[PDB]
């Protein structure tokens with residue numbers, strides 16, 4: 292599991308459950324190509340997006356659909372989504388945990404990178 | 407204005423207005439001596455807490471009553487308050503303390519400029 | 521000033537100065553049309569990106585080049601940039617986008633006022 | 635494990651390792667009484683601070699010594715520590731995870747509360 296995403300809800304003090312997200316990888320023509328997608332579990336975590344062999348060097352974008360999450364809770368939020376754009380594995384393979392902390396008008400995204 | 411505090415509401419996307427806070431300065435016996443207080447304005451800011459000659463070296467604590475802010479909005483928050491504890495004054499400096507409030511989370515940042 | 525961006529450096533406790541950013545507006549084909557751009561001032565702020573009559577309904581993206589900011593400080597950051605994507609203008613509103621930068625983390629907040 | 639603390643370093647993109655913290659509980663005389671203490675592990679986590687039987691209703695304060703952490707990394711930070719002051723278990727027992735995200739001039743503290 293080289294790429295994992297964890298999402299927290301700062302209004303409820305809970306994991307953010309059933310949050311959809313889409314991962315893209317920049318292709319040779321400099322367009323965003325679909326890579327993987329999934330939804331957070333009851334723990335707010337999404338595992339299994341990719342494998343060590345599949346997650347090669349590249350520039351990746353994770354688009355977390357925070358808007359649909361907030362709307363399902365009855366909240367009309369500011370952002371369309373929470374994004375993470377990063378270069379991966381250019382020093383060799385790493386494990387990436389992306390942590391997103393969500394409020395209706397604010398979010399933070401943090402990476403924990405281990406070798 | 408050596409010390410300014412700004413408070414934002416991350417639920418509503420607005421300044422957090424009428425947020426009360428007290429500032430204390432740590433005394434030699436390790437007790438917190440009353441120093442300054444006020445509440446945020448319609449812009450979410452609290453200005454005029456102190457003056458340059460009054461604000462000397464020490465450990466200061468800003469205790470922001472975030473619980474009362476959320477209670478007034480009918481949201482049951484996690485924190486009793488937000489406490490920002492820092493050593494101030496290498497000589498005088500200007501300090502802006504920002505607090506970003508959510509019911510179960512808060513962030514605080516300091517800008518120290520000249 | 522319908523749209524203002526403020527950027528802070530959480531490592532140094534300072535405004536983030538000379539941070540470049542582009543603003544795009546989503547077009548009908550789902551491509552990002554150039555809209556506005558600039559770089560932050562000595563106060564970390566970027567003002568004057570647009571006018572009320574120009575800033576109409578749409579989905580807007582602010583792409584802040586945080587990577588170049590950290591590279592200039594000799595710190596290898598995580599993010600290529602910070603992207604703030606939001607629907608703007610229920611009629612005109614005033615938008616302040618704040619970004620708080622660390623090498624491996626960023627936070628962004630919006631204040632929408634009248 | 636009704637109370638767990640997780641600490642992340644936003645400069646290095648790593649768990650914040652060997653961070654000391656002290657937990658206090660407000661006593662009947664309205665003073666802060668020592669409760670528990672410990673240090674974060676290699677994963678940035680501190681477990682085992684208390685037990686379901688020991689962690690009764692009350693007002694608790696966690697003081698995380700972020701200043702000594704940053705100084706050991708050669709950084710002179712703004713805050714003396716990162717604090718969390720909260721009422722616990724007044725609706726019945728809950729499990730509390732306190733997540734702290736650290737930068738030299740900024741920190742955020744978030745609670746995940748489960749039943």
Ligand SMILES: O=C(O)c1ccc2c(c1)OCCOCCOCCOCCOCCO2
Pocket residue numbers: 308309310359360363364
């Ligand atoms: O348990 C919660 O507090 C919780 C809280 C929030 C949950 C959520 C659960 O989703 C659980 C799975 O729901 C599947 C059926 O719902 C389908 C429609 O989902 C629309 C997006 O919902 C996002 C929030 O989902």
Ligand SMILES: O=C(O)c1ccc2c(c1)OCCOCCOCCOCCOCCO2
Pocket residue numbers: 302366367395417418479480481
């Ligand atoms: O402005 C928003 O988008 C917004 C967004 C979300 C707001 C919210 C506002 O709360 C505003 C004050 O609500 C009035 C009192 O409601 C009492 C019940 O509140 C239950 C918890 O609501 C959490 C979300 O509150």
Ligand SMILES: O=C(O)c1ccc2c(c1)OCCOCCOCCOCCOCCO2
Pocket residue numbers: 531532593594595645709710738
């Ligand atoms: O202002 C601080 O307290 C502060 C605090 C921390 C600063 C830091 C400043 O970096 C300022 C610019 O550093 C000059 C170039 O150093 C190159 C090597 O940097 C290695 C990574 O340093 C991370 C911490 O950088």
Ligand SMILES: O=C(O)c1ccc2c(c1)OCCOCCOCCOCCOCCO2
Pocket residue numbers: 651652653702703706707
């Ligand atoms: O592995 C790291 O990146 C790391 C990174 C940071 C580590 C840290 C490890 O501490 C590992 C345990 O060190 C025990 C011996 O050091 C005693 C003095 O510790 C002073 C406080 O250090 C806080 C940072 O500790």
